[PDB]
Each structure stands twice: as C-alpha cells, then as structure tokens.
Amino acid sequence: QDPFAGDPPRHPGLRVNSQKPFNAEPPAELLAERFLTPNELFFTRNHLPVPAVEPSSYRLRVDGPGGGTLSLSLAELRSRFPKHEVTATLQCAGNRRSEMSRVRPVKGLPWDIGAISTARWGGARLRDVLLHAGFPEELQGEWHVCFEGLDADPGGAPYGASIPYGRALSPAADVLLAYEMNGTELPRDHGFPVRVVVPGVVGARSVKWLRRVAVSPDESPSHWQQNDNKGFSPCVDWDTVDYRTAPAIQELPVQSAVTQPRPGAAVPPGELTVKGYAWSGGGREVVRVDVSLDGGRTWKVARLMGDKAPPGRAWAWALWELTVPVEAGTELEIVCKAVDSSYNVQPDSVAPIWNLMGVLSTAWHRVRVSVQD
Amino acid sequence: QDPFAGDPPRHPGLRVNSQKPFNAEPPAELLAERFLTPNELFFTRNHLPVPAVEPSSYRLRVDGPGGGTLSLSLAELRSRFPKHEVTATLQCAGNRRSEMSRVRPVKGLPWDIGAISTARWGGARLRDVLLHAGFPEELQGEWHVCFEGLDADPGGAPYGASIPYGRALSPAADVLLAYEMNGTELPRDHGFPVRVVVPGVVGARSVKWLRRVAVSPDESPSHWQQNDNKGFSPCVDWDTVDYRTAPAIQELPVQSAVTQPRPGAAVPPGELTVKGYAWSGGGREVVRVDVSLDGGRTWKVARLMGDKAPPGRAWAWALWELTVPVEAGTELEIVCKAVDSSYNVQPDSVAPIWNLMGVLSTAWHRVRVSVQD
Ligand SMILES: Nc1nc2c(c(=O)[nH]1)N[C@H]1C(S)=C(S)[C@@H](COP(=O)(O)O)O[C@H]1N2
Ligand SMILES: Nc1nc2c(c(=O)[nH]1)N[C@H]1C(S)=C(S)[C@@H](COP(=O)(O)O)O[C@H]1N2
Ligand SMILES: [Mo]
Ligand SMILES: [Mo]
Structure with missing residues (x-):
C-alpha cells in the first residue's frame, strides 16, 4: 500500500523535483507573469503524504495558558474571528539550491529560482485566536508559538515549526491561520483546510494542515526545526555540523x-x-x-x-x-x-x-x- | 572671528580627517580593544561648530499634539522620567568610505574602518517624553519624530533628522534622550547636554545638542536628511542624482x-x-x-x-x-x-x-x- 496514493492531482506543466513526497516549482516563464501566483502554479513543498481531511470533523487544537485545551472547528474559525487578508510571498530556504551544487554538491531538493510564490491569503489572525484562548498581549521573556501539521512520519512525529510569541501577537506582523488562498478555499497541497501563514519569514514556518497551536518557552523541538533550514559556514560539512551553533531561519x-x-x-x-x-x-x-x-x-x-x-x-x-x-x-x-x-x-x-x-x-x-x- | 574657536579640545591620538568641522576616528589598534569605547576615543562626526551650552538655562522644546509647546530643563529631564540605560553602537553611513574612493573617487569624509563606536547611554526614554507631552501610543498612518540640534548653518538652518513615530514610541526600540555616556555626563563633542540615541539606526539620526522634538506627518525636511545618507545605484553620478528616488538611511x-x-x-x-x-x-x-x-x-x-x-x-x-x-x-x-x-x-x-x-x-x-x- 503506497502512502502517497491519496495525494491530490497537479497541474501538468510543473518542474517537479520529487514525486513522493511532492515538490515542484512553476516554470520560470510563468513564475513572475502575475503578481499573484495562480493556486495551480504556486510552488509546492511537502515533506510527507498530503493529509485527507473531512472538513466537518476537523478540529484545531489550541492549548490555553493554564494547560486546558480549546478545540476549534473550521466553522468556528471562520465565524468567531474577523477575516483578515494578507498578500504575502512564501520562499523556501532551499530556493536556488541548484546554483550551490554547481560549486560543490549539496544534500536537498535541487530547486531552481521558483521555490517562491505569492498569494492573497485570508483567515483568522493568529493574534486573535491566541487572545481568545486567554493569552495576554505580552509574555515575559522569550516565548514561542509551536505548530504541528496533520502530516506525520511513519513513526508518528508530525511536521512541526515555530515562531516567536512576539510575532504571533503583533497586529502588524499579519500572521494568519488562513483558510483562503487567492479567493478560493485552501487547496490540499497548500494545507487544506488550515495553514499558518507567516509573512516575511521562511516558508518552513508556515505550517500546512494545522492540527495544533501551543505556546512554549522553547522553540519547536521537531527535527525539521532543529536540523533543517539553518545556515552554516562554508567550512562546515556533515562530519562536523553542530545544529546548535546556528539559529533556525526566521x-x-x-x-x-x-x-x-x-x-x-x-x-x-x-x-x-x-x-x-x-x-x-x-x-x-x-x-x-x-x-x-x-x-x-x-x-x-x-x-x-x-x-x-x-x-x-x-x-x-x-x-x-x-x-x-x-x-x-x-x-x-x-x-x-x-x-x-x-x-x-x-x-x-x-x-x-x-x-x-x-x-x-x-x-x-x-x-x-x-x-x- | 573663527566660528570654531570655542570647540572642545580632543585626545591627541585620533585619526582626524577634518579639523573644521571636527571629524575623527580612533586608531584602529584601539577601536576594538574594549567593548565600550572610552568617551575620549569614541568617533566624532560634526557638521558644524560645537554648541556652547550653559546647563541651567538649557530648554528642550517638545511640541505637543495640539500645537502647544512643552519646555523641559535638564533637571526636569533627569528627574521626571525614569533613567534607562542602553548600550548601543553608533555607525556613520560614511564608515569605510575610503575603500569606495579606491574604485572611483567620491565626495565625503575619507573614513577608514573606525566611523563606529559603542557606549552605554543613559537618559529619558523618548517614548516617555512623548507620552508626557500628551501623544498617544499609536498615531494613524505614517508619522515622524523630527529633531533639531543647537548647531546651525551661518544662515540659520539647524542640523535636523527624524525617525518614524513607531520607533520613537516602542519600548523595545530603546530610543533615548541621553544625558549620560559611559557613566559620565555627555561630552561637548558628543552632544552635551542632550542627544537622541537611536539604537540599530545610522548615526545621522542620533541628533546631538537637542533643541527641539516635534511630531510630523513627514520626515525631517532638513537638507541633511533629504540630500545626504541615501544609497544610489553605481550608475548614478552628480549630474543625474534625484534625491527623491532613494529613502533616507534608517x-x-x-x-x-x-x-x-x-x-x-x-x-x-x-x-x-x-x-x-x-x-x-x-x-x-x-x-x-x-x-x-x-x-x-x-x-x-x-x-x-x-x-x-x-x-x-x-x-x-x-x-x-x-x-x-x-x-x-x-x-x-x-x-x-x-x-x-x-x-x-x-x-x-x-x-x-x-x-x-x-x-x-x-x-x-x-x-x-x-x-x-
Ligand atoms: N505540515 C506541513 N507544513 C509545511 C511543510 C510540510 O511538509 N508539512 N513544508 C514547509 C516548507 S519547508 C515550506 S517551504 C512551505 C511551502 O508551502 P507551499 O507548499 O504552500 O508553497 O510549507 C511549509 N509548511
Ligand atoms: N546636531 C548634530 N547632531 C548630529 C550630527 C551633527 O553634525 N549635528 N552628526 C550626525 C552624524 S552624521 C553622525 S554619524 C553622528 C555621530 O555621533 P558622534 O559624534 O557622537 O559619534 O551624530 C549625528 N548627530
Ligand atoms: Mo522550505
Ligand atoms: Mo553620519
């Protein structure tokens, strides 16, 4: 039984660098044709099979300040919080990786110039969702908002990433729990029914297929956040790398x-x-x-x-x-x-x-x- | 009568690039010797003669929201607002200009690597001074806080610069009206008795010898803010430069x-x-x-x-x-x-x-x- 059998079909013209899991960019001749990248051409970066989600039984879990858990349906997310729209570009840290392999081969998906796209996103402000859960405007010290996706390793570990609490709570930072993309509901490949969108920040943190939002004194302990998308000196290779020496890209x-x-x-x-x-x-x-x-x-x-x-x-x-x-x-x-x-x-x-x-x-x-x- | 006759004496070891007005950097062998640059070695950038200020008759003028003017003495600035300390590096936009002249000659003071220094600054939060004058936490749209120094052109135009209102009012931005530098009162060359210190921002905006603070819908209209410290394409020269095409460095x-x-x-x-x-x-x-x-x-x-x-x-x-x-x-x-x-x-x-x-x-x-x- 193939774990990717239930993945969504895609537009035929994409430059695909991986089928399973699916990773593709739009052709470069179409990439910058429009300010807003059509949903069908928007670059797709998946680590795992795409979750199949029944909309009505979907629940977003939000942990409150004291340990309790708020559970939000899609309808509640739509109705309880004023919809906000943010036009924002997502860029993968791996964008233009292929030019780097020309110097000396690297691990990673061989992206050309198209691991970047732009959409008008629509959804609940993360700020408003956290205030509704009971959190204050401001926590003392350095706190993080950790996200988990519905997609998991064969062993159970879900895709996870985090942003600092300050950015989550900031009105101007425009962080959304988005359920709309270019005026239509979120496509499966792009996180249906809910994704975080973190404007101005690496694509890695915009967690698709959102299942959980938790506030923590530490950043996401997921291996994706700890081991990927960090920048090292040109002298560092796989036998000397110490993941603790470089910060997660934000x-x-x-x-x-x-x-x-x-x-x-x-x-x-x-x-x-x-x-x-x-x-x-x-x-x-x-x-x-x-x-x-x-x-x-x-x-x-x-x-x-x-x-x-x-x-x-x-x-x-x-x-x-x-x-x-x-x-x-x-x-x-x-x-x-x-x-x-x-x-x-x-x-x-x-x-x-x-x-x-x-x-x-x-x-x-x-x-x-x-x-x- | 020489307009610079009343300028303060300086430490003998400085690499001086201009006597009148005084511009100098510490020798490079002493520049990074200490984390905190001794006041006597801190780089000095003056456009004009240094103001001679009698401390007791000094008044900082702060325009209020409705047109009225608050007038603050040095004693009031010291006593009315909780003293805050910020360790901050000032760098001149012109730092390392000399390396640029090696490609093709440029106008400007020929700074080496030392148009940068670091001090622990102490003073009133600009935020607190503006709230005391009656301004709100937040103004609608893009507003600026404009500063004028006590130093002026022969024709009367004072040194002027501005920062966005958002930065002025932000607790975390640490913008000070500083009257202390490395634990002693401000030296004359460094703005006695009061200077703005704008952390994380080009030295140009940290206005010395502060006489006025005003809130404006527009940035400082001074020729220093409009005509200096802006960055252009390498193709631009003095016959084609249009100052409106590049933003003031912040x-x-x-x-x-x-x-x-x-x-x-x-x-x-x-x-x-x-x-x-x-x-x-x-x-x-x-x-x-x-x-x-x-x-x-x-x-x-x-x-x-x-x-x-x-x-x-x-x-x-x-x-x-x-x-x-x-x-x-x-x-x-x-x-x-x-x-x-x-x-x-x-x-x-x-x-x-x-x-x-x-x-x-x-x-x-x-x-x-x-x-x-
Ligand atoms: N749940 C989940 N969220 C995720 C990913 C993932 O594999 N699983 N990939 C991340 C990375 S590394 C990137 S670059 C962006 C890409 O988003 P897109 O597919 O909508 O372009 O999604 C991020 N969010
Ligand atoms: N009033 C006044 N403030 C001023 C200046 C000036 O000429 N007059 N020079 C500015 C510039 S361009 C720089 S780089 C910094 C340098 O500050 P320092 O002399 O304390 O290093 O002060 C700024 N504030
Ligand atoms: Mo990514
Ligand atoms: Mo400067």
Whole structure:
C-alpha cells in the first residue's frame, strides 16, 4: 500500500523535483507573469503524504495558558474571528539550491529560482485566536508559538515549526491561520483546510494542515526545526555540523532572480525586456533592483512594478522589468541584484555563501543569452 | 572671528580627517580593544561648530499634539522620567568610505574602518517624553519624530533628522534622550547636554545638542536628511542624482572589519590572533563571522566575544577573534565577513555597491600582511 496514493492531482506543466513526497516549482516563464501566483502554479513543498481531511470533523487544537485545551472547528474559525487578508510571498530556504551544487554538491531538493510564490491569503489572525484562548498581549521573556501539521512520519512525529510569541501577537506582523488562498478555499497541497501563514519569514514556518497551536518557552523541538533550514559556514560539512551553533531561519535575506529571458536563449536584435522578481524578509521593502548585461561590470536601474506597502510590511515580492537595446551577434550575461529598506544587498558569488544544506542561496542570479543576427 | 574657536579640545591620538568641522576616528589598534569605547576615543562626526551650552538655562522644546509647546530643563529631564540605560553602537553611513574612493573617487569624509563606536547611554526614554507631552501610543498612518540640534548653518538652518513615530514610541526600540555616556555626563563633542540615541539606526539620526522634538506627518525636511545618507545605484553620478528616488538611511546592513593586525604589517611565525568587530542594523544579532587568510577562498569561524542580547535588540557590536597558525615567509590576505539574524550577508566586492556619496560601504574588509622568517 503506497502512502502517497491519496495525494491530490497537479497541474501538468510543473518542474517537479520529487514525486513522493511532492515538490515542484512553476516554470520560470510563468513564475513572475502575475503578481499573484495562480493556486495551480504556486510552488509546492511537502515533506510527507498530503493529509485527507473531512472538513466537518476537523478540529484545531489550541492549548490555553493554564494547560486546558480549546478545540476549534473550521466553522468556528471562520465565524468567531474577523477575516483578515494578507498578500504575502512564501520562499523556501532551499530556493536556488541548484546554483550551490554547481560549486560543490549539496544534500536537498535541487530547486531552481521558483521555490517562491505569492498569494492573497485570508483567515483568522493568529493574534486573535491566541487572545481568545486567554493569552495576554505580552509574555515575559522569550516565548514561542509551536505548530504541528496533520502530516506525520511513519513513526508518528508530525511536521512541526515555530515562531516567536512576539510575532504571533503583533497586529502588524499579519500572521494568519488562513483558510483562503487567492479567493478560493485552501487547496490540499497548500494545507487544506488550515495553514499558518507567516509573512516575511521562511516558508518552513508556515505550517500546512494545522492540527495544533501551543505556546512554549522553547522553540519547536521537531527535527525539521532543529536540523533543517539553518545556515552554516562554508567550512562546515556533515562530519562536523553542530545544529546548535546556528539559529533556525526566521526572516530571510534580500533575494532576486531573472525570469525573462531564460538561460541559453537566442533573443532578437533591437530591444530586450528583462523581467524578474525581488523580495526581502521581515517586511523590508525592495528599494532598488540593479540589472547588468555585462556580467556585473555596469548596472542600470529596473522599473519596480506594483504598489507600495506600509513601512515594515512589504510581505509581497516586487516584480521588475527593464527594456534595453541589444546589438546583433553579441553575448550578454544578465545579472540582477536587489537592495532592501535596511540597505541589505546580495553578495557577488555563491562559493563564499556555500553551505552543506544548500539553503540561503542569494548570490546574484546570472543568465547568459545570445543576440541573433 | 573663527566660528570654531570655542570647540572642545580632543585626545591627541585620533585619526582626524577634518579639523573644521571636527571629524575623527580612533586608531584602529584601539577601536576594538574594549567593548565600550572610552568617551575620549569614541568617533566624532560634526557638521558644524560645537554648541556652547550653559546647563541651567538649557530648554528642550517638545511640541505637543495640539500645537502647544512643552519646555523641559535638564533637571526636569533627569528627574521626571525614569533613567534607562542602553548600550548601543553608533555607525556613520560614511564608515569605510575610503575603500569606495579606491574604485572611483567620491565626495565625503575619507573614513577608514573606525566611523563606529559603542557606549552605554543613559537618559529619558523618548517614548516617555512623548507620552508626557500628551501623544498617544499609536498615531494613524505614517508619522515622524523630527529633531533639531543647537548647531546651525551661518544662515540659520539647524542640523535636523527624524525617525518614524513607531520607533520613537516602542519600548523595545530603546530610543533615548541621553544625558549620560559611559557613566559620565555627555561630552561637548558628543552632544552635551542632550542627544537622541537611536539604537540599530545610522548615526545621522542620533541628533546631538537637542533643541527641539516635534511630531510630523513627514520626515525631517532638513537638507541633511533629504540630500545626504541615501544609497544610489553605481550608475548614478552628480549630474543625474534625484534625491527623491532613494529613502533616507534608517537601519544599516550587516558590517564587519579587521582591527588586528593592520595592513602591511609584518607578523611573527607560529600563531596569529586576528581581531575585529561585527554589527548589524535594526537590533539584528551577529550570528557568525567567517575569517579567511587566503583572500576569501577558504574560511574559518571566529569566536564571538561578549554577551547575548534579547532577540531584536542587539544594539551593540560583537567583537570577534580567531587564533590561527601562520607559516614563515608567506603572504596572507585576511578577510572577514559577518552574518546577521535575518541571515543577511556582506557582498564580495566594492565596485557593485559603489555610489556617488561613498556611503554604505560593507564589502569584505581585506587586510594584506606578511609573515616573518
Ligand atoms: N505540515 C506541513 N507544513 C509545511 C511543510 C510540510 O511538509 N508539512 N513544508 C514547509 C516548507 S519547508 C515550506 S517551504 C512551505 C511551502 O508551502 P507551499 O507548499 O504552500 O508553497 O510549507 C511549509 N509548511
Ligand atoms: N546636531 C548634530 N547632531 C548630529 C550630527 C551633527 O553634525 N549635528 N552628526 C550626525 C552624524 S552624521 C553622525 S554619524 C553622528 C555621530 O555621533 P558622534 O559624534 O557622537 O559619534 O551624530 C549625528 N548627530
Ligand atoms: Mo522550505
Ligand atoms: Mo553620519
């Protein structure tokens, strides 16, 4: 009996890197076509079989401050708390892992530039759910909100992750228990019926198929939170790694990639429209994207599309374009790099940011194309 | 009559880049000797003559919500609000400007690696001063707290800067109206009797010789806030610059430099202790410093000294060291790079981050030395 037999069907055009469990990204030519990634193209990252959930018997378990347990149905989650909408980009820590393997092979799913997508999410504020359970605005010291998914190891251990309590309770942090995605109910692959969405934070923490929410003095003790998605020095390998030396990724650094044109393409002479995305963690706005055609020697400023968000709440990626003249029979190396609102920047090369897990791959994206005659 | 005749005397050992107005950094061999920079060595950045202030007639003007003005004496500032202490690093946007001129000359003071220092500051919380003036915890929309110094242009325009209202009112942001520095009253060069200290934010906003605090729907309209300390694309020069296209620097990106040994030094064979500082903006902790001896090809992890701060409140730099073996008659190129709590990193080279103002210089610091026989 195959544990994945009950997995949902998917859109045919996806770049699949794993069938069981299912991991896929949209083609790069469609990735940044729209500001909001259609649900069918939104990248999918699963560690386990997809839970099959009967909507009416579903209960979200929320542990209260004193040890008691609140049990919430989907209907109650919909009706008791004012629905809030947050447009937010999820990026996997493993995004662009494949460029890291080009330096030296790494463990992990070989993501290209598409382990990132954007949706308008709708649901209960996590803040409101915790206050209803009885928690105060503020706990003394460093507390965490731990989540468990309905998906578990063969031995019983569920997918688990956590965020700091401060972020959970913050109105401005926009943390949702989402049951809607781009205006329709959550797809199975994306957490039906309920997922956490943590804006400005690595995808790992946005726990799908939510079964439990608990408040703890410690972060999630799940092996996913303890052993994955941490960043190490380039000198560290599997025989020397000590998971305690690096913190769980929460906010991600500034990131950008070229979606148009594609590597190895032949483009017509005259004008070329270069397109891509840019994004940064922690609600930090993209203030600028620089684009080079000559391998990063000279730069021009891209046009940033779409609308400004409030300060500290730039949860959604900025899409960018730049139309440039191109000469017949030349070689272009197209490079992009982004600058965020704290003026963080992307580093020149991959090797100095290499790590055994292939996470945190934010060096300049480089695309080599030729111009036709 | 010389406008600077009344300026305070300074410690003899400083690397002075401007006498009038006075701008100087501590020697690099003393810069990171102590976690807390002695007041006499703390870097000094003045745009103007230093105000001469009679303590007893000094009044801080605070505009209230409705148009009225609260006037505070130094004694009242000391007695009415509970003294709070914040250890915080100030870094000038112009820090390491000189490395940028090596690519292509820039305007600005030619700072080396020392336009940064750390002190334990003591004073009134700005939060408490604003609440006492009558302001609420929260204003609707994007509001700013504008500061003016006692120092002014020959034409009358005072040094001015601002921070967002949200940061001013936040308990955790630790914004002070400081009258103490490393346990003694504020030195004249450092803002006597009162300065703003804005932790995790560029030095520009920590307004010295404070005369006025006002709340505004707009940021400071001073030419310093509008025309300086903004970051542009490397393609921008003085004939194309449009100050409206880049935001005033608030939080700074991750930064680090080698203080020991010094460029061109001859060091003994056997063991070499490399020392430096690392720091990041926005209360983001330094989670790691990587050190290279071979120009950034291979890296080792430094020891981070000193104590952990609360999450999101790492206002003070991390000092680091690494003892390595060195072979007689070899050349070393010593490189350091830091990683912060959002996993932001420093870029490889200066040219791609070059800008006409020479600000935001955070590429890897490189120090070339030789090992004796
Ligand atoms: N229950 C559960 N939640 C989960 C995962 C999972 O395997 N199980 N994967 C996580 C990781 S690592 C990522 S990157 C995001 C991806 O979400 P998406 O599939 O909606 O893009 O979901 C996170 N939430
Ligand atoms: N009134 C006033 N405040 C000021 C300045 C100034 O010229 N006048 N310089 C600013 C800048 S650009 C910097 S980097 C810091 C430096 O503070 P320090 O001299 O205590 O290091 O002060 C800031 N506050
Ligand atoms: Mo992920
Ligand atoms: Mo400055």
